[PDB]
């Protein structure tokens, strides 16, 4: 593997082995710094440019602690403070940033800014969350998963909620773990067809399987992990109700988790509301959230090193 | 003295002693630091998380150069860049917090929202200014008169203006120090009335007297320090006039030095309006005002250090 | 030369062998981190107070992060996170930052504003642009075209756009270097007569020569460099269209460059908008316009080193 001056904007660019060698230095990084207390200045004397367009609480304090607490120093970014609505073209934002900072995470709106910004920047792009993907959560999640269940093939994922870039990511990704994806969404609020289709394609490819449905209980029937995200989230768009409408009954709750496999456990990229998920799943014993969350910055970590140095984790290969 | 793992929401949780720590620990790192120029990485490694709700300068700067100056990372976090309202519920972004950050310090306005976050919390809270209390502001404070007058015991401070944050947190300390307070502020300005029962009781503990009046002369008779903040501030709120009313004749001016000891100084937390003093007073070669605002460096790095790490102060303790 | 502890808010108080000194040690600090990979933690316990009234990439990008790679913390502060209009008095705020930070970097809008912080703050205060200068702008310049023909002394500046803080900085500048300079501006848009009169001055001082006209292809005429940057940029006002009227035929485009000298090269401070250049000058291979923002860090890298620290040039100086 050789991920050094690469972007990541998509785990679709990435291969299985790609992939596990950045949970693998996760793993090394979080062993050696968290467990040892070792202080490693990998990113000593690197800076990154952390463009963020929409609010952020985890991308923001994982990615920014993260770069820091390898020696490099983030810069947070922002529409206010910066040129770059009508401001300035994004050809020459991304010329500057190359010659200013060593890497740039950006959370956009369009997957296409995050495309020029990579074709134009000779520094890796790193995306922060995009309308169409949100690859570094699921970075997060299944290192998250390999910790809880000492390794990752034949597990079932179970989405449910709205075919969004958290699922975009996740059917990315799944199959090269060997994994199978049994995903929910209301009729209407479907994962991207191209997306769909290569995700069949990586399933065909692992042998693994794939469902695609509107109902809850069919997409959590014999899942070991229940997975969901706000689908309510319309902001505030008071036409909304749709939203309400087409999505009732996609609340995760213990009648969910009666038709999962035995030794479930749940998922949530966060932040959450109380219409996707009720209390007792939210803060089960079973429920992985917290972890998550915390791995969001184990992996950036990971993420940055392997773009930016040529460290090779110390680590033994964990059992995917 | 064990302090490691402590929340400083409030002084009234502490103990003469735990108080005197601290501003031992921030005379040994200034010092240190500032007198023989030694670089101290004490919070290498770490990181704070500074959620600010309203504005801040002084508090700002301090906390955030002062982390940095010890190695760690100071991460500035507002309402508008992360989820905080409606966005994400306090008791998930207090555990997310815990596992990203070492340490948080808020300024927020609710005291309750400080309580939740330090509940929730398995890091170190610090309050950054809440409208109840305000602590680092009195540990710099205090400091500054160790410096000015070689000592504190004995000391009468002289409150003027609105029985607000800081004068809570000079009542929840003084008499801890075995100093006097003479506190005025208009009728319907008192301090809260739970604070001026505990404050009562460590001036009975202690020996100290506490005086409360709506008399400024009053409370400036023989007083060493003269104390103010802001009292006008309705922000701009038309309907006012009556925080202008009630507060007429709360300006400290000479006329209030003349009643106060021939030693006396002036003490203002900033930033500093015409309305609550005078320019004589305030940039008379006895007010401490630029003093005090340094100051706020050197004890929020004293207490940063003193809940994160296992330091010990080098320097010999200060006479108190 | 000695320039450590002096702020920079213009180049008129700069001699020639002074700025050129600062042009030396950006050269130095950039092969020695750039082309040698070497850590200079030269500004190791250092902070920087950053004050930002505007919108800024470039400034803001090469001061934080050429801060942060000499070992400093840099403290992105603006007006609507800390204390700054009718707020706080500058004054105040000016004597804060001067016992919390070791120098601060302000773009504002008022010059009148930078010479109160200078006056008032007893630590190094840097302009990061004003309505009337921008002096670190020019030293990024200067350094790009040094490095490109080889020496500076001889070169002709063309200025075709408004008479503003840019052609201010040149005109404070150019003639010391012994650079000769034509710019054109529209009627009523000339520089201020102030500074032209002190340009007139360096002129007869370095035996260069200065030419002030309304036509852009006479300010062309012979010119080795061709530098412009926005006129059009009236924001958004309505009732423009005057600067828009005033300024046809100010677009520097190839008609521009036949005028000029044969070895000509062209410099855009940046952000750029259509109407002061076309693409086919922006993106000419004789475009310096990336290479000269690049060069904005390492000048001001040089700035902050030269105003904090003893430290002297290991590199040959730079033929000028």
Not at 67 to 94: K, M, W
Not at 160 to 177: E, R, T
Not at 210 to 237: K, Q
Not at 273 to 283: I, M, N
């Amino acid at each position: 593997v050789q991920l050094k001056g690469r972007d990541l904007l998509t785990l679709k660019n990435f291969t299985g082995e790609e992939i596990k060698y950045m949970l693998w230095l996760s793993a090394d990084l979080k062993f050696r710094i968290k467990q040892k207390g070792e202080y490693l200045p990998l990113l000593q004397g690197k800076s990154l440019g952390m463009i963020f367009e929409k609010r952020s609480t985890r991308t923001r304090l994982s990615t920014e602690t993260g770069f820091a607490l390898l020696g490099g120093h983030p810069c947070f970014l922002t529409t206010q403070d910066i040129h770059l609505g009508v401001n300035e073209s994004l050809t020459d934002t991304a010329r500057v940033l190359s010659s200013m900072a060593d890497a740039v995470l950006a959370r956009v709106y369009k997957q296409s800014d995050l495309d020029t910004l990579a074709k134009e920047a000779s520094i890796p792009i790193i995306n922060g969350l995009s309308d169409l993907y949100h690859p570094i959560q699921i970075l997060a999640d299944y290192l998250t998963l390999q910790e809880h269940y000492s390794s990752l093939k034949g597990l079932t994922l179970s989405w449910i909620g709205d075919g969004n870039n958290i699922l975009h990511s996740i059917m990315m990704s799944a199959a090269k773990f060997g994994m199978h994806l049994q995903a929910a969404t209301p009729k209407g609020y479907e994962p991207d067809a191209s997306v769909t289709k290569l995700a069949e394609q990586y399933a065909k490819e692992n042998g693994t399987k794939l469902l695609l449905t509107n109902d809850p209980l069919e997409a959590a029937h014999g899942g070991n992990v229940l997975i969901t995200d706000t689908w309510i989230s319309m902001g505030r768009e008071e036409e909304k109700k749709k939203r309400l409408q087409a999505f009732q009954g996609y609340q995760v709750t213990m009648k969910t988790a009666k038709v999962a496999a035995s030794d479930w456990t749940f998922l949530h990229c966060l932040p959450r509301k109380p219409e996707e998920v009720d209390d007792e799943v939210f803060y089960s014993p079973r429920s992985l959230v917290f972890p998550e969350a915390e791995n969001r910055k184990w992996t950036i970590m990971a993420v940055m090193v392997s773009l930016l140095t040529d460290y090779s984790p110390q680590l033994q290969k964990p059992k995917f």
